[PDB]
Design a protein around this ligand. Sequence first.
Ligand SMILES: Cc1cc2nc3c(=O)[nH]c(=O)nc-3n(C[C@H](O)[C@H](O)[C@H](O)COP(=O)(O)OP(=O)(O)OC[C@H]3O[C@@H](n4cnc5c(N)ncnc54)[C@H](O)[C@@H]3O)c2cc1C
Ligand SMILES: Cc1cc2nc3c(=O)[nH]c(=O)nc-3n(C[C@H](O)[C@H](O)[C@H](O)COP(=O)(O)OP(=O)(O)OC[C@H]3O[C@@H](n4cnc5c(N)ncnc54)[C@H](O)[C@@H]3O)c2cc1C
Lengths: 213, 216, 216, 215
Amino acid sequence: HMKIDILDKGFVELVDVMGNDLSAVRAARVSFDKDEERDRHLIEYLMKHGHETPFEHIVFTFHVKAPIFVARQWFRHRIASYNELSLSYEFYIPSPERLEGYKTTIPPERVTEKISEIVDKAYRTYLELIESGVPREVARIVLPLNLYTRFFWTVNARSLMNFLNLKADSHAQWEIQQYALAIARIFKEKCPWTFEAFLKYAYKGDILKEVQV
Amino acid sequence: HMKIDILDKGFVELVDVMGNDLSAVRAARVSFDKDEERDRHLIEYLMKHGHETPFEHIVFTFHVKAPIFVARQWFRHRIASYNELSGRYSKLSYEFYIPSPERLEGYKTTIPPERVTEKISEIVDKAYRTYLELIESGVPREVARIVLPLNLYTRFFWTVNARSLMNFLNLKADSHAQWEIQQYALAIARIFKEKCPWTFEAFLKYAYKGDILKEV
Amino acid sequence: HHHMKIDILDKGFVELVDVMGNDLSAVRAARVSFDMDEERDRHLIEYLMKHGHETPFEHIVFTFHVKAPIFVARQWFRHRIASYNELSRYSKLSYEFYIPSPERLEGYKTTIPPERVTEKISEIVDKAYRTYLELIESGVPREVARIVLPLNLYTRFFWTVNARSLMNFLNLKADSHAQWEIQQYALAIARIFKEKCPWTFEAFLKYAYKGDILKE
Amino acid sequence: HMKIDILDKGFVELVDVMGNDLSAVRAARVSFDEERDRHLIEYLMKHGHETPFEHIVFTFHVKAPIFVARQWFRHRIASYNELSGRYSKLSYEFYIPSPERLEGYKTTIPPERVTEKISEIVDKAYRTYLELIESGVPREVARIVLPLNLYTRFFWTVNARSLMNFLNLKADSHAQWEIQQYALAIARIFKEKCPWTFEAFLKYAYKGDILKEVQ
Ligand SMILES: Cc1cc2nc3c(=O)[nH]c(=O)nc-3n(C[C@H](O)[C@H](O)[C@H](O)COP(=O)(O)OP(=O)(O)OC[C@H]3O[C@@H](n4cnc5c(N)ncnc54)[C@H](O)[C@@H]3O)c2cc1C
Ligand SMILES: Cc1cc2nc3c(=O)[nH]c(=O)nc-3n(C[C@H](O)[C@H](O)[C@H](O)COP(=O)(O)OP(=O)(O)OC[C@H]3O[C@@H](n4cnc5c(N)ncnc54)[C@H](O)[C@@H]3O)c2cc1C
């Protein structure tokens, strides 16, 4: 059902989800059983007064493809579960549009060309080492930080909201902002009430109030 | 739609589950995209080599009604999520765990087992009544209720991934735990086996550290 | 040499057993370096606190020894990003209980005089204890007997907590909406944290602290 | 500060430590004779009562290739502060495996060629990086061309229980040789600060292989 492309070869794909906004309502009340307006008011109430633990009973699993340098920033979120690929070889090459804004001394397209060339040289050294009998765990160290990896991320909505706080923000690196908007979108579609209360009361960042879904 | 009664008025109820044995398999392979023997071999392989992180992608929510002493041993499992009943969003009720006389069997007591049951009962009744008398007096509940005993039943939601569930089972599905938390762990075990049989079967065979799940 | 003890309630306490690092520990983590002028290091602590960059404060760690009634302990133990070891089989067990003083019931217009409330609590507590002792005398195992004991029975535990998690604790428990009893314990924890990490603590009150009682 | 050099440019260094074997013994006893206290450590470890070891805490300063750092940061029950790829100044150094690293494989070019080929490619990527910086390209973008052998630095605060889990998984022959080396350095510092706990860990709860044959 839900897969969003990010960057040149990335994605965020939704694998599974447990619960919805009413999961947090039931957990707060500690009752397994509905009144829309009242249950909506509770979500807002929880979020307004920082009673956030009921949001932990909503869990998501994502399959994410992102460059290693993005993954490293992501994996710093410790309240979450991860399984990473331990195979195929693709790389994020920034478009020229990624480098307009910045005043530079060579054309933005030349930057894209240069990055692409160095990637090609590195990969080729790697394949050459692999063909020589060099084990992969050694041969791969020449590969650049823009090598795509993939991982499964299982994460509850509370910790997901910490992630949005930190990464759906103009101080975060643009690349990771893009992934974060994809995660915000899937989150909004599954837990609309919780996302809305979040934006309203607890969200510390800037982009999700700018840019729809 | 799965509930097990525990002790005289307790229960463990399955509220929700995300995934099944195949969720760990997809995690280990990092593939969203069938061969059944193949998939089991992998579950067994993961278990026996201690690669437990794929099992974190299976998750349960349980609703447990337990006496406070039990809940305190339970809440010590930090890698999980909890919400306890508070009289702030929901109705509170007052029930207490009274051991059956069978519970003292094995122990050579000076007092008959039924008399132990009755003494526990008497104390519950007297504490509960002192409590009520205090509320009626205008003592706030937060103060009044400090006289209630440890066998007062509480309720909570517990959301826990399989890896941490297995840890719980290693520690509480064991003869070394208090008998009351064992019965709760047996119920956990049973719900877990129902929803992830391949995993549970591999857990017993390879990773389970306790004793009682291999007799019941 | 690190060591402080603050008495809380009638028989409770919070004791500092050890501390790793100081304000400069956070400064060093944030820079990934070995610094020890104060002007700049202080600016940086504020900077970090302001912008919600809290990870460096995780590199300051405290160990506490806490004697608190079980009801206070249950709330405390909900803080999962911390390490706990509660008293057991390695030490002698003692039996003391939190009796509130009449003044605790001030402002509450009560049907019986506050001294009577205090006296009622002692009675029912004493009764529960004496029943406990008689069950123990009769051969009832302690894990069964003890379930009659009330929520004001004092326990002891060690708590090892880092400064970021400590600050979260103070945000939740040093607040007029927490139960008074725990507010008192939070005030002792705030006191010890101020003493040992003055810059962080002061930055915390100005930029991040969410409660009301510490700013009095 | 104890400091142990690992690989060509790396290290583990001890920034601070809280407590020692007795910190666990005090935690276990819940209270503020050497044979009795050593014997308690053994007992705890033997019967699975590991929570008292959470009250011994370390902070390390580690300089490691990014590929080692990445395997390391999967240990979530710890606190980490790293140089910023976007902002921090770096030493731009790189791990060049010795030729001896390849001995044990049959390869079709000599191990020294392999070492040299790794150097060349590292060299071209670094120079390309410098031309991009030189050109006005911000570092958060220009750095994506650097290889995974680039050395980074991080602070690591971790309690002894979590540290023992790390040693179970990294001071082990199935782990990549490079992280083994770092694990041995961490095992050395641990052993020095907490001799009783360390001996007990080897004897009752250590699941790896190498710390039992490598002092
Ligand atoms: C106004 C108010 C009313 C409340 N009412 C109730 C109630 O009725 N019942 C009830 O049970 N609790 C209630 N709580 C919550 C209860 O107080 C918490 O269990 C306690 O405050 C622990 O706080 P914590 O989870 O932040 O601390 P810790 O558990 O130490 O967590 C520290 C921080 O780490 C993060 N964290 C740690 N583990 C996880 C995880 N698994 N998933 C996501 N994030 C994680 C969170 O960001 C958290 O803030 C209420 C809280 C407030 C503020
Ligand atoms: C024989 C025996 C006797 C015991 N006696 C006592 C006693 O007297 N007093 C007492 O308080 N406890 C005692 N315990 C331990 C107590 O039972 C545990 O707190 C409880 O069983 C929870 O286990 P856990 O920490 O593994 O689970 P969780 O809290 O869910 O942690 C799960 C796993 O994550 C890791 N972990 C989580 N948080 C941290 C952290 N902050 N630091 C390092 N690692 C972490 C651990 O590897 C742990 O195995 C005893 C246990 C045993 C087996």
